[PDB]
């Protein structure tokens, strides 16, 4: 799904990284991440992300 695609892009694209750091939630929503996925990111739950 979209998690892997998003994380790969974010990891190597400095423009996206800067956008993300300005507004994490908005950038994640713009890339289609679910509320559950966003919650896992914001609470720093890496195990949950892996399962999703």
């Amino acid at each position: 799904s979209g998690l892997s695609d998003f994380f790969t892009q974010l990891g190597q694209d400095a423009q996206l990284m800067e956008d993300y750091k300005q507004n994490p939630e908005a950038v994640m929503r713009a890339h289609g991440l679910t509320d559950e996925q966003i919650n896992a990111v914001m609470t720093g739950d890496m195990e949950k992300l892996k399962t999703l």
């Binding site: 892997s4 994380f7 892996k50």
Partner: protein, 259 residues
């Protein structure tokens, strides 16, 4: 055939060097050891012909000496080289830092008359300096494997930044478990107390592997290490306990002083 060992760094996708990425892209076959499924997917998109070295770790609660895992990894890599493949080994971090498989594979490949080289990558300690805002040159740096520090005679310089790698398996002598015990960590604490007070602040550090993830930078007194939650990826940072003192003998020979 030929061998190139590259590092992928610690962060997903972006921390590999440009040239190292190119090596992966153009490889006939890639042997990987990566942090997680996200990095695994990234790799497979770059080059679909991947063999995951993870398979060589103990699989189903088997008792297996880690040395045997490493030997099997090396043999897997060499089999590809011997067969005539342009082989790349892609290890997380720097492929030659606290990592024996690449060095071993390169040694063996050269011995057998094959071209073999290592490309440097960004290691866990490289990440630590950036994340903690510490220069290793400030008062110096020392690194040891934690178990090696326990089993062999090593003396740290307590004016430096000291890194104990593989802290999660400190004192685990069999090489057959992925964690140690609180009792072993207590022995390490008592050992370190030769140079570091029990209340000395130490840092459990984990570099992030994902772009949305913050590093772990957990400060605690040394005394509390045995109760701490440690992961395979944890590195222990022990900052200086002692300030630099003047080397008067050498200063005098140089004809200079503190001023």
């Amino acid at each position: 055939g030929s061998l190139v060992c590259v590092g992928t760094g610690l962060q997903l996708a972006g921390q590999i060097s440009v040239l190292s990425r190119s090596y992966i892209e153009h490889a006939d076959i890639v042997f990987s050891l990566l942090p997680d499924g996200f990095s695994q997917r990234w790799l497979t998109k770059l080059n679909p012909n991947v063999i995951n070295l993870q398979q060589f770790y103990a699989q189903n609660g088997e008792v297996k000496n880690r040395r045997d895992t490493y030997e099997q990894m090396v043999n897997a890599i060499l089999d590809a080289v011997r067969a005539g493949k342009k082989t790349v080994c892609a290890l997380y971090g720097h492929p030659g830092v606290f990592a024996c498989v690449s060095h071993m594979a390169i040694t063996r490949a050269k011995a057998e008359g094959f071209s073999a080289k290592m490309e440097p990558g960004i290691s866990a300690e490289a990440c630590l300096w950036a994340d903690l805002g510490i220069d290793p040159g400030n008062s110096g740096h020392q690194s040891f494997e934690a178990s090696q520090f326990m089993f062999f005679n090593h003396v740290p310089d307590p004016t430096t930044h000291l890194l104990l790698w593989q802290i999660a398996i400190a004192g685990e002598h069999t090489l057959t478990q992925f964690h140690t015990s609180s009792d072993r960590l207590q022995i390490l604490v008592e050992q370190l107390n030769q140079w570091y007070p029990l209340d000395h602040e130490v840092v459990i550090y984990e570099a992030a592997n994902l772009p949305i993830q913050a590093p772990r930078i957990e400060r605690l007194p040394l005394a509390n290490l045995p109760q701490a939650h440690l992961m395979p990826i944890s590195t222990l940072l022990i900052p200086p306990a002692k300030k630099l003192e003047y080397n008067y003998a050498i200063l005098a020979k140089l004809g200079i002083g503190p001023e």
